[PDB]
Amino acid sequence: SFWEWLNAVFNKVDHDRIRDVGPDRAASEWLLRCGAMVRYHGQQRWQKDYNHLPTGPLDKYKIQAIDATDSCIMSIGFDHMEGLQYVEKIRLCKCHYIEDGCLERLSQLENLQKSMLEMEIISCGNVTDKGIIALHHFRNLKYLFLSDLPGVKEKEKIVQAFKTSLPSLELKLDLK
């Protein structure tokens, strides 16, 4: 359908664009066009309007935090994450297209394994235990908040899994 194509082209990576403006700017464009927000290292305020992203010096601004609420990000859109070196916080809230494969793709990016400190996954109805358990590759994670994930059926197993793989993790669960 047209809507499938439209979501796909919102997500598709343009590698020319990454070459021209660098990974952080290209990912910022992807996130904001898809209804997410980003916040750069050294800045208090969030980027929430695509047209107000900085034009500024080339590749200066580095994403620290991502807040994708009510966003159409999915699957291969996360390939925009590949070049980012300094992402510490990700919130995925009411991201109706996210699935386990998105979380798997993120978990395999060594750049994110090195930098990630905090993640929050809220009201993303497709996510299951499999996608959550993939997050154990974020070896530096200190905070994980899971909420309203009806597909996560075995929350006790998740707690024990993380107890072993990430003993220092503060795991906050608001799960049925």
Contact (Cβ atoms closer than 8 angstroms) between residue 107 and residue 81: no
Rounded to whole angstroms, the Cα distance separating 67 from 32 reads 10
19-58 residues near Mg ion, rule: CB under 5 A: 35
Contact (Cβ atoms closer than 8 angstroms) between residue 63 and residue 40: yes
Tell whether residue 111 is a contact of Mg ion (CB under 5 A).
no
Q: How far is the CB of 7 from Mg ion (least distance, A)?
A: 15
Of 24 and 67, nearer to Mg ion (C-beta) is 67
Task: Find out whether 125 is annotated in a ligand binding site.
Answer: no
Of 69 and 111, nearer to Mg ion (C-beta) is 69
Near Mg ion by CB under 5 A: residue from 20, 59, 70, 174: 70
Q: What DSSP string runs through 15-53?
A: HHHHHHH-HHHHHHHHHHHTT-EEEETT-SS-B--GGGS
Q: How far is the CB of 37 from Mg ion (least distance, A)?
A: 6
